[PDB]
Curated annotation (Swiss-Prot):
Signal peptide: none annotated. GO terms for biological process: removal of superoxide radicals. InterPro entries: Globin, Globin-like_sf, Myoglobin. It comes from Physeter macrocephalus (Sperm whale). It is an enzyme of class 1 (oxidoreductase). This is Myoglobin. Residues 1-147 form the Globin domain. Its main location: cytoplasm. The keyword Oxidoreductase applies.
Length: 153
């Protein structure tokens, strides 16, 4: 798991995200969809977006990026004790949206990339390592719930 020093790194970086939730959210979803256009196919809501310029122009996509980062932030702030927050998310993503764990890996890479792009000075390799560990813990706990419900992978 994460050391206290590592949680400190994660939580101090997150405060920088909270200074511009919509901007980070929009950048992360666009990075995901450009890097892995197969992920776009899971969203009936967005699958009509064919080009990067169309994604940037979508107010609805920006709104969902706020939804995603708000939910992720609430989880990170629980410092590993996130069972009540994580369970409804695992439920809906396994049983309704049908999102494979690999796509959670892809969005984790997108988050790291955008944090680096927006915060090149402050987001050094130690914070990157710590953020990677936090996102791994998130995936590990979701995967456990997926396995319980008989989805896993
Ligand atoms: C950081 C990881 C993620 C977080 C925190 C997250 C959070 C959420 C939240 C809070 C909702 C709305 C409530 C719900 O339906 O559960 C949602 C909806 C959804 N999510 Fe996720 N999500 C994440 C990753 C993904 C990925 C990687 C995909 C697909 C590749 C995905 C697909 C969806 C879809 C299809 C919906 C329904 C959207 C709609 O039609 O309104 N999510 N997400
Ligand atoms: Zn891909
Ligand atoms: Zn706008």
């Amino acid at each position: 798991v994460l050391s206290e020093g590592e949680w400190q790194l994660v939580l101090h970086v997150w405060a920088k995200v909270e200074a511009d939730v919509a901007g980070h959210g929009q950048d992360i979803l666009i990075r995901l969809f450009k890097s892995h256009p197969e992920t776009l196919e899971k969203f009936d809501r967005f699958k009509h977006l064919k080009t990067e310029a169309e994604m940037k122009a979508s107010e609805d996509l920006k709104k969902h990026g706020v939804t995603v980062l708000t939910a992720l932030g609430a989880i990170l702030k629980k410092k590993g004790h996130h069972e009540a927050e994580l369970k409804p998310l695992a439920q809906s993503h396994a049983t309704k949206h049908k999102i494979p764990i690999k796509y959670l890996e892809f969005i984790s890479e997108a988050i790291i990339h955008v944090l680096h792009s927006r915060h090149p000075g402050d987001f050094g390799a130690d914070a990157q390592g710590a953020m990677n560990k936090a996102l791994e813990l998130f995936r590990k706990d979701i995967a456990a719930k997926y396995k319980e419900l008989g989805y896993q992978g």
